[PDB]
Amino acid sequence: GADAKTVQDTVTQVIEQNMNGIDNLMYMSSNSDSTGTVQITLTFESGTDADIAQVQVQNKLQLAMPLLPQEVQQQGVSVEKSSSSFLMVVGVINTDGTMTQEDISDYVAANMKDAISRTSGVGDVQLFGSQYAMRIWMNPNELNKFQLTP
Amino acid sequence: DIAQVQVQNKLQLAMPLLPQEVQQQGVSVEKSSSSFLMVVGVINTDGTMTQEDISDYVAANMKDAISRTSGVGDVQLFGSQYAMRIWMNPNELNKFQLTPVDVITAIKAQNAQVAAGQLGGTPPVKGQQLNASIIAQTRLTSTEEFGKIL
Amino acid sequence: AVFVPMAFFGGSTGAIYRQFSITIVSAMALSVLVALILTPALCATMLK
Amino acid sequence: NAVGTGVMGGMVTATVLAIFFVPVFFVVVRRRFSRK
Amino acid sequence: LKVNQDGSRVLLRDVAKIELGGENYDIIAEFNGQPASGLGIKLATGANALDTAAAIRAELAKMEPFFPSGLKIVYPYDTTPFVKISIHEVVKTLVEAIILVFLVMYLFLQNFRATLIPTIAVPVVLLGTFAVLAAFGFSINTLTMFGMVL
Amino acid sequence: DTAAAIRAELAKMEPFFPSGLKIVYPYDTTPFVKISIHEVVKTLVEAIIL
Amino acid sequence: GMAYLFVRLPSSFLPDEDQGVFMTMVQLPAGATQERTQKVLNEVTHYYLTKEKNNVESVFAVNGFGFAGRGQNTGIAFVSLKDWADRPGEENKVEAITMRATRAFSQIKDAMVFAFNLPAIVELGTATGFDFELIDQAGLGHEKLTQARNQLLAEAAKHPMLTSVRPNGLEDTPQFKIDIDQEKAQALGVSINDINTTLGAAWGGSYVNDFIDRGRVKKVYVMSEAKYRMLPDDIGDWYVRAADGQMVPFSAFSSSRWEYGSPRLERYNGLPSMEILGQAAPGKSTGEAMELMEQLASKLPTGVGYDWSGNQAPSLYAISLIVVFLCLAALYESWSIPFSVMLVVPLGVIGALLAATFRGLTNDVYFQVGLLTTIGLSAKNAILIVEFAK
Amino acid sequence: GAAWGGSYVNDFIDRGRVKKVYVMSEAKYRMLPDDIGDWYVRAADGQMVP
């Protein structure tokens, strides 16, 4: 839910302040979206190990982890190796026993995505849609009709 | 490199066995040297400022950068960065019948940023033309606005 | 003397100019040792 | 095509020029002897 | 949720709709217009690339057999065949350039035995470069393959 | 190398300072490196001449 | 002539080529919907399906995922062309496929859709192109920085030996602000905690708990039907509990008024920045254009700083000029042979240049090492007309 | 703890950079041990307590 300004100085800034003291490092950029999703990239010197370079950055974020909204803490915080480029992009459809573009997004993410994102050092798997989740569509009229809130 | 990681990926296991004031306080794991080298003093001559105005501007411009650039072990700050300071009065609290617990709760309510979804939400109704993010409460800016906490 | 000097790569042109030079410089030393061991032998062994 | 067009071009003008006409012969003439 | 004065049981079904739907309805995938969902694997900074995408099918090979009715796989945007072809087009030239030098060797050296030494010389020199570049860390890169042929 | 890059990062902070805010350099290691090199390389040349 | 065949020969890094695979991104105007952008992706997917059957084998459209980032404005489509044997012409090659494609979208649409060969190179290093950045060094706001960005972009186009400059992706759409009067809240008897988590759970949803679903643990979310959170008049529908056991309208304590805040706030190197993707002039090249760009950012207001073949080569061949002469006296000691082979250098190179300048080739990495080999062979031939004759 | 030693309550914004918010007390009401009596606390029955 968080708008672009909220994430920019409640998750983004808090890390950026507590994102220092790392061996080899050119710069860091940031992107504080209105979807409520920040992503900070740090480019290092060429030839530097991606193994240790990752650990140093994520063993410093961890110090700013308790300085974060509690909704953000239980949300997905990830530190991985970037490549701004896909290679295998395996589409999955249905023909016979037909299912929606959500039934498939769930089954893909509840069978293969868990495995693929681990097998042979895969950097960052993308999911085209989303996994299922017990969804509830609250009604405001019915809540006041019984005297209630979310 | 690895000697640091092993020590701080073990502290992390005792992180939830710590006072909650300590958790949000600065927990750091870095490389020691019990010895400085460059110690760059910063003063003022023309547009004069105190030994606190300078400690803030040093820590809100350079310290964030220097402590990261070229694997700097541990930057020291001679003074401290600014912070919205409040000097409670005991006579005035009892004169209105109050405690510091009522003041702490007042800032943990009015001084905060909240996630307010968006018009044309994630799943909309097929037919909507608009999609814009909602704004909620804002983290206070000035000393004047911290004075008007009800 | 023209390959390996230029094989001192730099920047994003790292393994770019490097790999090309060394691949052919290794190939040159291997071609020379073959031209000092095999080609000489094979030739003496059986050319005519 | 980016490799070969560059090499092909040079090899035509490397030999057909060197072995014949232009230096690779005029050299030793005015390098070994010329003045010393 | 509640039980109003006259013991009338208020359930969460009465106040709102409840369906098992997407966790995130922001993105939606349409393979050739038809509804669908896939996986967009990106590389891990300093990964083996082709070796990774070969093991993408290894893990994904054992998911295939337990798919429900209709659930089939399809392959858009794929890197694999560009690797397979550039190897096959460069190794194609290697063999051409050998056959062609064998003709130039026969037209000058009418001796059939004499047009063999150079034809059997460079086969060994190339294999040496594969033994040398493996010993220095390099692989069969697009670059080191032109390095063979050049 | 670290303290040389301390000035590299700090070089681009200098230009956007407010009125009066200037830098000064106490307790510094840099010139002891610069001098011990220059005194040893000085001997190298002496010992050659001699 | 050799010099002139070499100075005027343009310098690219590495040639972009057909990969049997390209793509194309989407970008709708400010505050567009998932419904609006989905209409655009449909026209794009089908330009490939009906007017490109001989080329395209399979499309894979995606609504709400651009390579800028995310949002109901953005989009993309992953093309997967038919194999190279069934694509005979140069018209059937990615070069020409992304030519009439990019043209088609510009004509029969009202937003922005392009197309591009996937840089067979890396993301970075395009040649005759830059990535500028516009930092706010002082304590200026985001709105003051945006004005300096409109002044930098303005001056470049005011007098471009040109340039081609644009912003990165800060459209700056409006936002529905809600000011809650804290005074009214306490008077009617409502907690501020309750008011916030009603607005956050209703419009934006909320991660409440986890549950089990056929083995795998998934999430539990609570939000609201779309029809009670589409426009700003639906805020009044939500009533909150009050101390004195009764409901309270949102409008009671609420205030509604629109604003202008950006939907993405870039922050380059700990400070608020805005990215400026411009290319070098069609006449000039990178280093010329970048040098004629730092002088334009230095004409902006106070508290507004900035940050960004090979120059490598000049020194590379410099060591080639030394090791040659020393290896040319390691077996050819005289000071006659060390200068003999020094002439075959431009004998071969004049021709290498000439072939690349004739056809559409450029000075890329392949030609740069195809030049090294041209000099290597050149030495061989010449040294044979020396080692023998000596 | 909040009176004599202060307390990290929340964060706030100050010219871009997020900083801290602290609550303690003027020095003059926490210098010696006789100033402990100045602080009165709320009690269940809506009244202060020394």
Side-chain angles (χ1 to χ4, degrees), chain A residues 82-83 96 119 128 146-147, chain E residues 2 37 43 45 59 69 74 77:
Chain A
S82 141
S83 282
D96 180 31
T119 303
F128 291 69
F146 291 69
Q147 307 171 266
Chain E
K2 200 148 74 175
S37 175
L43 250 212
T45 305
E59 184 69 55
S69 182
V74 70
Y77 187 164

Side-chain angles (χ1 to χ4, degrees), chain G residues 147-166:
Chain G
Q147 182 55 65
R149 168 181 137 289
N150 280 85
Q151 189 177 95
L152 176 150
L153 292 161
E155 286 286 286
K158 188 233 219 339
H159 67 303
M161 303 198 218
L162 283 81
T163 21
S164 158
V165 302
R166 276 303 183 181

Side-chain angles (χ1 to χ4, degrees), chain E residues 23 27-28 31-32 43 45 61 64 74 78 81 85 94 108 112 117 140 142 150:
Chain E
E23 180 199 314
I27 54 160
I28 54 184
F31 180 61
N32 302 58
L43 250 212
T45 305
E64 308 201 56
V74 70
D78 186 29
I85 202 70
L94 169 281
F108 279 47
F112 196 57
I117 324 202
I140 303 200
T142 286
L150 176 54

Side-chain angles (χ1 to χ4, degrees), chain E residues 37-83:
Chain E
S37 175
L39 285 155
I41 304 99
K42 108 172 26 275
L43 250 212
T45 305
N48 303 276
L50 159 69
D51 284 57
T52 305
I56 270 191
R57 184 45 174 277
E59 184 69 55
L60 191 129
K62 296 303 217 168
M63 279 127 214
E64 308 201 56
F66 300 81
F67 285 173
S69 182
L71 204 269
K72 175 174 92 288
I73 323 193
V74 70
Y75 307 86
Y77 187 164
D78 186 29
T79 268
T80 280
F82 198 50
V83 173

Side-chain angles (χ1 to χ4, degrees), chain H:
Chain H
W4 300 75
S7 147
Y8 185 99
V9 191
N10 210 63
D11 287 306
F12 87 115
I13 263 57
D14 181 61
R15 300 184 295 285
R17 281 181 59 77
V18 56
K19 322 207 185 156
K20 316 185 163 164
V21 184
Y22 277 106
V23 61
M24 198 150 67
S25 56
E26 317 200 25
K28 50 174 279 146
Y29 300 92
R30 59 161 166 77
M31 291 320 290
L32 334 127
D34 302 286
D35 300 335
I36 307 235
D38 290 305
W39 304 97
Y40 308 113
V41 185
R42 181 95 54 74
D45 51 20
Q47 61 155 310
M48 262 64 230
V49 177

Side-chain angles (χ1 to χ4, degrees), chain A residues 19-142:
Chain A
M19 192 98 300
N20 52 294
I22 299 124
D23 304 315
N24 296 261
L25 182 37
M26 300 212 74
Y27 47 76
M28 103 184 129
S29 75
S30 144
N31 274 348
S32 315
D33 291 289
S34 66
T35 318
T37 48
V38 68
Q39 195 182 62
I40 296 95
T41 314
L42 312 86
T43 314
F44 293 65
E45 310 291 55
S46 194
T48 296
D49 282 308
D51 287 294
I52 173 61
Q54 185 208 62
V55 175
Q56 293 195 274
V57 100
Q58 104 108 246
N59 282 18
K60 234 289 172 242
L61 175 170
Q62 183 200 132
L63 318 181
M65 258 328 272
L67 288 240
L68 279 189
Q70 54 157 75
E71 291 87 46
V72 137
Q73 248 164 325
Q74 59 174 193
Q75 235 58 227
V77 201
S78 318
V79 185
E80 0 163 64
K81 281 71 157 283
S82 141
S83 282
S84 319
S85 68
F86 310 118
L87 28 143
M88 271 240 138
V89 182
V90 203
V92 198
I93 74 185
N94 200 290
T95 66
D96 180 31
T98 305
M99 39 204 267
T100 63
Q101 54 185 319
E102 196 67 82
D103 273 89
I104 302 159
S105 310
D106 155 65
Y107 181 52
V108 159
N111 194 64
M112 307 180 275
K113 169 156 191 319
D114 226 62
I116 278 31
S117 65
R118 180 189 314 131
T119 303
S120 63
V122 160
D124 176 30
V125 172
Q126 190 63 52
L127 195 280
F128 291 69
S130 222
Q131 181 176 55
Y132 269 155
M134 193 78 260
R135 229 60 177 72
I136 293 183
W137 307 116
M138 290 193 290
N139 203 293
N141 289 353
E142 285 280 330

Side-chain angles (χ1 to χ4, degrees), chain G residues 17-131:
Chain G
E17 41 191 318
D18 193 308
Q19 287 193 271
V21 162
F22 79 105
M23 71 206 226
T24 153
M25 65 183 69
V26 190
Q27 182 56 55
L28 274 286
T33 22
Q34 184 172 59
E35 214 214 34
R36 180 180 317 164
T37 186
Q38 180 52 65
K39 181 220 171 18
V40 185
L41 284 137
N42 280 312
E43 296 190 65
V44 174
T45 310
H46 298 11
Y47 175 86
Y48 299 155
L49 289 156
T50 180
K51 295 179 113 8
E52 222 91 74
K53 291 177 256 166
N54 291 77
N55 300 142
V56 181
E57 171 59 56
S58 102
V59 198
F60 192 93
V62 181
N63 172 171
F65 176 29
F67 246 121
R70 303 187 82 203
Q72 289 167 217
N73 309 334
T74 58
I76 200 132
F78 290 178
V79 194
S80 190
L81 296 158
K82 230 302 199 188
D83 73 284
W84 337 68
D86 292 70
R87 277 180 313 149
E90 195 248 287
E91 319 319 308
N92 297 46
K93 184 206 174 78
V94 173
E95 231 303 282
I97 295 180
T98 58
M99 267 289 321
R100 71 179 76 75
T102 48
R103 154 175 307 130
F105 303 117
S106 68
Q107 300 215 131
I108 53 162
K109 274 104 210 186
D110 66 276
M112 300 171 282
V113 181
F114 317 129
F116 45 90
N117 54 261
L118 307 186
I121 53 171
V122 188
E123 180 67 277
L124 60 100
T126 45
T128 65
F130 65 73
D131 184 17

